[PDB]
Write a protein that binds this ligand. Structure first.
Ligand SMILES: CCCCCCCC/C=C\CCCCCCCC(=O)OC[C@H](COP(=O)(O)OCC[N+](C)(C)C)OC(=O)CCCCCCC/C=C\CCCCCCCC
Ligand SMILES: CCCCCCCC/C=C\CCCCCCCC(=O)OC[C@H](COP(=O)(O)OCC[N+](C)(C)C)OC(=O)CCCCCCC/C=C\CCCCCCCC
Ligand SMILES: CCCCCCCC/C=C\CCCCCCCC(=O)OC[C@H](COP(=O)(O)OCC[N+](C)(C)C)OC(=O)CCCCCCC/C=C\CCCCCCCC
Ligand SMILES: CCCCCCCC/C=C\CCCCCCCC(=O)OC[C@H](COP(=O)(O)OCC[N+](C)(C)C)OC(=O)CCCCCCC/C=C\CCCCCCCC
Ligand SMILES: CCCCCCCC/C=C\CCCCCCCC(=O)OC[C@H](COP(=O)(O)OCC[N+](C)(C)C)OC(=O)CCCCCCC/C=C\CCCCCCCC
Ligand SMILES: CCCCCCCC/C=C\CCCCCCCC(=O)OC[C@H](COP(=O)(O)OCC[N+](C)(C)C)OC(=O)CCCCCCC/C=C\CCCCCCCC
Ligand SMILES: CCCCCCCC/C=C\CCCCCCCC(=O)OC[C@H](COP(=O)(O)OCC[N+](C)(C)C)OC(=O)CCCCCCC/C=C\CCCCCCCC
Ligand SMILES: CCCCCCCC/C=C\CCCCCCCC(=O)OC[C@H](COP(=O)(O)OCC[N+](C)(C)C)OC(=O)CCCCCCC/C=C\CCCCCCCC
Ligand SMILES: CCCCCCCC/C=C\CCCCCCCC(=O)OC[C@H](COP(=O)(O)OCC[N+](C)(C)C)OC(=O)CCCCCCC/C=C\CCCCCCCC
Ligand SMILES: CCCCCCCC/C=C\CCCCCCCC(=O)OC[C@H](COP(=O)(O)OC[C@H](N)C(=O)O)OC(=O)CCCCCCC/C=C\CCCCCCCC
Ligand SMILES: CCCCCCCC/C=C\CCCCCCCC(=O)OC[C@H](COP(=O)(O)OC[C@H](N)C(=O)O)OC(=O)CCCCCCC/C=C\CCCCCCCC
Lengths: 198, 198
């Protein structure tokens, strides 16, 4: 009944709060209408003064922008022309290097790679010998390792049998009384929770 | 009470592990003997070849580095002067723009700033007129609201205390027997818990 009892107190509070909400909304709206009224009168200024002023305000910037664009247009031509001349010369000068020095670089790269290719020829072959040498060792040693690993695995399993059979059996035999004790304790606990919490 | 039994079986499994460790380490060391020597057989011809691999490779690389470095002096060096001259030209080009157009842009800024002096400044003063009215409304409406908030505070405090008295009274009234009831359940719970967790 505690929940329903306190529920009444909440409901009565809500009732009186709702009774207050009326005057509150009335006063709030009444005052809001005043604030909005001031803003309504302000509208004939904040929006109207700026509407009349928006003409010369935008006009000033607009005309200046026109001049700025005109000035930019009168300069964009010679500027682009100079940049064009500069680019032409600078790029032509660059091409004067990208061609001969470029080809020379390619020719040098030929010898660079050719020497590398020539060096890598016996290198790769000797690397094959290295691989074969390592492979032989790793194969012979690997075969021994596999055999050893197998023996180890066998013995590991042999000793694991002691855990799979004796240890497991012994543990299971010890778990049985544990489960029995657990079941009792669980039953007791279940009853406790049902007696005091239900 | 079967902790000793459980530990006993675990001790035996540890003993079996020790029984393994003996031969296992012995053969593992014999394995390592093959692995170390095997790796040494691979590493001997490896390191001995490294001398006859890194040296000639470094030689070829040094020659390549020397060639590349020479090419830098036959490319990067002259191009540095060309790029520097090109930069000097571009700088001149830029200076012949940053100066005249700079003064132009600076004058444009003056035109905009002076405009703002007749745009923002006066508008700010006109804004003061609006702010005066806005703040006036906020002061008037706020003053009325302040009184309303005060009255609402009393109307809220009266209702709060109106509920507080019977609420606290009933709460304490119900808390008394509820606490006693809780004591009974708490006691009976703990008393039985001690019997279960004995
Ligand atoms: C149907 C539904 C029913 C629901 C239940 C209804 C019944 C509820 C039952 C009781 C209600 C009252 C509970 C108790 C209120 C205690 C108020 C209080 O005054 O208690 C103060 C004490 C700390 O005393 P002191 O400082 O003087 O100690 C030191 C003093 N000297 C310095 C001498 C060192 O503290 C405490 O008792 C409380 C423990 C410490 C609190 C530390 C401050 C925690 C603040 C916020 C926690 C926010 C958690 C959630 C965050 C969400 C984030 C998203
Ligand atoms: C439909 C249902 C809607 C919801 C209904 C909710 C009903 C809630 C009913 C009851 C409130 C329950 C929660 C009460 C929480 C505590 C309130 C309080 O009583 O905390 C007072 C403390 C006094 O501190 P002390 O130093 O004396 O002791 C310090 C002691 N120690 C060590 C342990 C910190 O305050 C402090 O500790 C430090 C902070 C003090 C701040 C004071 C600020 C005063 C000015 C402006 C704040 C206005 C906030 C208005 C919030 C809305 C109100 C309607
Ligand atoms: C010192 C203390 C003294 C006493 C103070 C008392 C203050 C009382 C004030 C308000 C009482 C509120 C009572 C609410 C009762 C429960 C209403 C309700 O139905 O709870 C459940 C609903 C629906 O579930 P949910 O959405 O919560 O969860 C959705 C979870 N999902 C995401 C799964 C689906 O909740 C909803 O519908 C969403 C509800 C959102 C409510 C927002 C806050 C409304 C309060 C005021 C509105 C503004 C008033 C002023 C306006 C000024 C304008 C200029
Ligand atoms: C709080 C801290 C961050 C503040 C960030 C903002 C700071 C600046 C102040 C305000 C900026 C507000 C920006 C967001 C505006 C609302 C955007 C929106 O998404 O709103 C959605 C809602 C709900 O509908 P929806 O989501 O589907 O919106 C699209 C469909 N739709 C037509 C029917 C609304 O929209 C609605 O509820 C109804 C919307 C009706 C809008 C009427 C606009 C009339 C235009 C001018 C009126 C006269 C102005 C005179 C000068 C006044 C100067 C102060
Ligand atoms: C200490 C070792 C046990 C000692 C007692 C038992 C000894 C038993 C006999 C010999 C011991 C052998 C130990 C090594 C066994 C390696 C087995 C193995 O095959 O290895 C490789 C596998 C690889 O994956 P896969 O088998 O799926 O094959 C691939 C499957 N395909 C195709 C999806 C992706 O490994 C895996 O699988 C996942 C392996 C995850 C192992 C987690 C071990 C966590 C143990 C301790 C953590 C904390 C260490 C630090 C403690 C500090 C205390 C102060
Ligand atoms: C001392 C100790 C012992 C020795 C240790 C070192 C041993 C080294 C032995 C071998 C290392 C081999 C490394 C490379 C392996 C992959 C070889 C390969 O199969 O490569 C194929 C590419 C195919 O190109 P593609 O024109 O047919 O495809 C054109 C595709 N589409 C249509 C976009 C443009 O061959 C190409 O790209 C080449 C043409 C493109 C070149 C791009 C720039 C390369 C930068 C510098 C030159 C480096 C030269 C030396 C090798 C550097 C390898 C990073
Ligand atoms: C023996 C050792 C000799 C070393 C010689 C070094 C200097 C070599 C000079 C010239 C010849 C070698 C040039 C090597 C670099 C360019 C290689 C190249 O031809 O690449 C071509 C690719 C083409 O891509 P795509 O757009 O056609 O396809 C995009 C879409 N997809 C992925 C799927 C294809 O990429 C591109 O063309 C974009 C290339 C952008 C420029 C890259 C320049 C890289 C060169 C040096 C950078 C070094 C940085 C060092 C930082 C650490 C310093 C301590
Ligand atoms: C690709 C190959 C290109 C080769 C040619 C490259 C040419 C350009 C290379 C370098 C030019 C300088 C780059 C910046 C170096 C900053 C160094 C530094 O350590 O500077 C610290 C100052 C500390 O100032 P403070 O107030 O503590 O002390 C009072 C002022 N003090 C420092 C000088 C006593 O830092 C400050 O002053 C912060 C304010 C700095 C204002 C600088 C205004 C310069 C004039 C116009 C602005 C231009 C902006 C361009 C933006 C990028 C456009 C693409
Ligand atoms: C409908 C409701 C109407 C108004 C009801 C007012 C009474 C409310 C009644 C009970 C409590 C309401 C809820 C109060 C919540 C308090 C939370 C709090 O915990 O507050 C204290 C903590 C202290 O933090 P601290 O000491 O570690 O740091 C201090 C940093 N430092 C020095 C800037 C001082 O504040 C902080 O944590 C950081 C934030 C501190 C904010 C302080 C704001 C002070 C502003 C005005 C004070 C007005 C006092 C008179 C009010 C009369 C109302 C009628
Ligand atoms: C960590 C990664 C950094 C990446 C940087 C990328 C941009 C590099 C920019 C320009 C090119 C490099 C320009 C390097 C200019 C170096 C100028 C210079 O004096 O550097 C001095 C440092 C000294 O290091 P220390 O550790 O000895 O001392 C540090 C000192 N105490 C401190 O307070 O830090 O050593 C160094 O900084 C580097 C020493 C290099 C030695 C070999 C120099 C060899 C010279 C040329 C190389 C030719 C290669 C040709 C072949 C190319 C491939 C084909
Ligand atoms: C009347 C009860 C009726 C039944 C009730 C059943 C439900 C009970 C549920 C809750 C009630 C208890 C609620 C207890 C709440 C405890 C809250 C608490 O104290 O938090 C702090 C403690 C602090 O421990 P400590 O001081 O050791 O650690 C300090 C820390 N190292 C440091 O640097 O300062 O944290 C710890 O102690 C954690 C480690 C503890 C180690 C020792 C743990 C010791 C545990 C048992 C002791 C041995 C029992 C042997 C068997 C007895 C029965 C046969």
């Amino acid at each position: 009944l505690k929940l329903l009892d306190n529920w009444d107190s909440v409901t009565s509070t809500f009732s009186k709060l709702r009774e207050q909400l009326g005057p509150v909304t009335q006063e709030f709206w009444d005052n809001l209408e005043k604030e909005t009224e001031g803003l309504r009168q302000e509208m004939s200024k904040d929006l109207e003064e700026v509407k009349a002023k928006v003409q010369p305000y935008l006009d000033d910037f607009q005309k200046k922008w026109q001049e700025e664009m005109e000035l930019y247009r009168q300069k964009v031509e010679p500027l682009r022309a100079e940049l064009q001349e500069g680019a032409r010369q600078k790029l032509h000068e660059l091409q004067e290097k990208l061609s001969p020095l470029g080809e020379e670089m390619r020719d040098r790269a030929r010898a660079h790679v050719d020497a590398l290719r020539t060096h890598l020829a016996p290198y790769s072959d000797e690397l094959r010998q290295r691989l074969a040498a390592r492979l032989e060792a790793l194969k012979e040693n690997g075969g021994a390792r596999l055999a050893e690993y197998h023996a180890k695995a066998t013995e590991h399993l042999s000793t694991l049998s002691e855990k799979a059979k004796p240890a497991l059996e012994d543990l299971r035999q010890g778990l049985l009384p544990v489960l029995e004790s657990f079941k009792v304790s669980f039953l007791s606990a279940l009853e406790e929770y049902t007696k005091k919490l239900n």
